[PDB]
């Protein structure tokens, strides 16, 4: 076929694009002795899907007369093989002046002239950070699908970063609202042993303290053995019924595999989105015994016409007449057998929206009239940025907005797992848009009597009961009714003291008597 | 000016002269100290004809105060000697303006610069950057460190705690990477050894030049109240220095006393925190830092953008007193880094005592040679472990307030190759009669008295007598009593049974 050659498209303005067209060979991960650019060959469907989706979005912008009237908008896509080393080279290429192969050093770059107008950013948050630190110095506007880490919202370090997916803090505030509204206070929080889960733990630990939720244990579970046994043992020794599992897929898979292997107890699990789309996790045969699973999932329109477009253009890509119309081997050896699994992935909309945003931002920057654009000097990136920072735009007829933190405002659904025998299915229970609404009466529980489980702590005692502090931050108390025959001693002391040989006192007594 | 010196080969240097145009932030004494330290090192290497004959070794230095400006000096170092920088699939034949970079000291900027220099395999040596993830040579192939890792600092803390038998500690962490990562690492280390964390709390980020809000004050008040009511009197602190000035003042306002404070390497040697008079009331202050090695002749040497400093001399002229009393602890890292590059370069050129057969030094070859050096400086062997670390001695210090004495007294020495704490000397405690301070969740039980756990922490247990008809076999179990044989009895709390009908 001839499909790599389509990854570049001339125009009056050009969008840079970063996608994982390939994947690194997990078995090799060759270490480097000499400073050559690494190469990858292993194909992956979803990265190419997003690439085609971008091509589709730019094609739509070119077809329509309303946006960028009479201009030709192009694109320039490159393969980020998940490595910072691989991703950095095209990041530099984006900045080399037109026709050149060189990037001159300067003390300042508001004066400079890069060859692309904006960069559609990489999927993963690690590459998002690495490339954002570089791009933001040049004030190159970067619009990212996929990357959700909240650290990228900080404008003191990422002044030019935007994204069409909500950051983790929205999901975790929804989770905190869920915990508070249901009246649970005593919970355990596990993150995966990667920066996604660890930073999620930081965010959730900060959020919970504002609402009285006291974390019984704040643990991390490894990615690929005694560690999981220790973590689950400490969670089991805690009298916790509600567990937050903000994990990557493989870590959750391992945790549940061992929990089934250990005949673990059933519990309420609150799910990360990455786990919640659980096709390979929910297939574990023992999963039904683990207790009820809830989680917050994005809601957004699918790019309904996408599969037909992919069919059409992969049919065209093998037509030798179309070949009469560069940077990836094995991209030209792809047919629908390889690709036709991910066609429904919602990331395609986020990619689609991303392109639209830049187009609209340029359209507002040029101030093009509906009949045609005014005469203009070639627009610069830092000229887009100031108009883009407060944008409102329409994608598929849906309105969208960037606030100054760079995130889109988008709502979430509460999803519950329902067991059709051995088949688990996702079902809808509620909605979150800054406040939480739930169909409480529609939930089914794992307890034999189908009633809500209880997980909470007494945050104050009464009558001078014996107190013990508990919780990872020491914000819960457990209260003990000191038994008749011993007395409180000091009302803040750890334990009671016994009366004399001929003395006695009642229950909870702060005194001793005869 | 000091920031540039020509030569036949050049070293790049990144130093944080200001806190967080970097001049807008407050000048830091230690940053300027290390800035001049590198100058002394290069002066020595240019003087000694035996180390690099027929070669002048130059340097260029740029300020990196914080995560702000890090991209600029990297692009400025990598240029092809005329501000150009070609985009290549292979850089094997490329002459960068510097052959090596003496990189930053704060983890975020270190990683930021390393991710960029990794493309060219330009060797980077960083001083005093601790984060353990820097041991990953697949993620960071080009990076080496003249400092022990966070692993060793935490292990030294743990062995200090074990030696004086402290089971019950409070951990305070700043609201950023330095606090969070080291708090997690300490959490991993502590649990396996029988020590227990009473609770962990995140300190709110505050600045001495800024007014504290009432919300932040309430947060600090809550933390200090938790400190006040708890039985754990050992406090470990992971924070940059600036946050602490408010914190301790609040601690002083609430009349807290009697704790042992363990300072991590970020603030264990801060002169400014040391200067406050009232900290004497808060108990003993201990810290962990790399050992003093005296650089000979050094002190009387210290007496196109972001390459300047106006405040440095005026701000340093006062704290130079404390520096002169102190042990030059971090200077040796920079000194050794420059000497390591010098030896690797000498052997890369195949140079004799007489002359060097000069060649275009492509940085990847200099990295290949830097991996192999092994030599003595000031009677200490330096060579790189495969992960890129250099085995400097760690040292535990007590803060001493008899002014005009040495302000940071050595009390123990930690050897990393042996992973062991040794040569412990006297620590003068705050206690009423200079006894070792005590902290456990509960007191050790009497004989014949079994242990009953109070919570998740193994460190916490009640004591309960074994009843008549049972005895406690300490040698085999201690959490439950044992029944006496078929014709024996016991007198409640006792270790053994006796014969009775
Ligand atoms: C994010 O940085 C941190 O949180 C802190 C504080 C800091 C912030 C900004 C710039 C520099 C340091 N880092 C450290 O203490 C690093 C460990 C690491 O960061 O890997 N060990 C350095 C100990 C001697 C030191 C020399 C120079 C100093 O200033 C010029 C300074 O403050 C401390």
Residue numbers in the entry:
A (entry chain B): 23 to 246, 253 to 353, 368 to 556
B (entry chain A): 25 to 44, 58 to 340, 358 to 555
Paper excerpt:
Sugars and other sweet-tasting compounds are detected by the sweet taste receptor, a member of the class C GPCR family. The sweet receptor is a heterodimer composed of TAS1R2 and TAS1R3,3,4 two type 1 taste receptor family members that share the distinctive architecture of class C GPCRs: a large extracellular Venus flytrap (VFT) domain, responsible for ligand recognition; a cysteine-rich domain (CRD); and a seven-transmembrane (7TM) domain that mediates G protein coupling. To address this gap, here we present cryo-electron microscopy (cryo-EM) structures of the sweet receptor in the inactive, unliganded state, as well as in the activated, sucralose- and advantame-bound states. Unlike other class C GPCRs, such as mGluR, CaSR and GABAB receptors, where agonists stabilize inter-subunit VFT interactions to promote activation, the sweet receptor is activated by the rearrangement of a TAS1R2 VFT loop, which destabilizes interactions between the lower VFT lobes and the VFT–CRD interfaces.
We also determined the structures of the human/human receptor in the presence of advantame; in addition to the compact and loose conformations, we observed an intermediate state with partial separation between the LB2s. Advantame also yields well-defined ligand density in the TAS1R2 VFT pocket of both human/mouse and human/human receptors. Advantame adopts a bent, arched pose within the clamshell cleft, with its Phe/Asp dipeptide core and vanillyl aromatic ring extending across the clamshell. Advantame engages TAS1R2 Ser144 through polar contacts, and its hydroxyl and amine groups form hydrogen bonds with conserved Asp142, Asp278, and Glu302. Although its interactions with TAS1R2 differ from those of sucralose, advantame elicits a comparable conformational change: the bottom of LB2 lifts by up to 8 Å, and the clamshell opening decreases from 112° (apo) to 104° (compact) and 103° (loose). The closure of the TAS1R2 VFT clamshell induced by sweetener binding leads to the formation of salt bridges between LB1 Lys65 and LB2 Asp278, which are brought into proximity in the compact state and engage further to form stable interactions in the loose state. By contrast, in the compact state, the inter-lobe interface remains largely preserved relative to the apo state, with the distance between the LB2s changing by only 0.7 Å. First, agonist binding induces clamshell closure in TAS1R2, accompanied by a stabilizing salt bridge that defines the compact state.
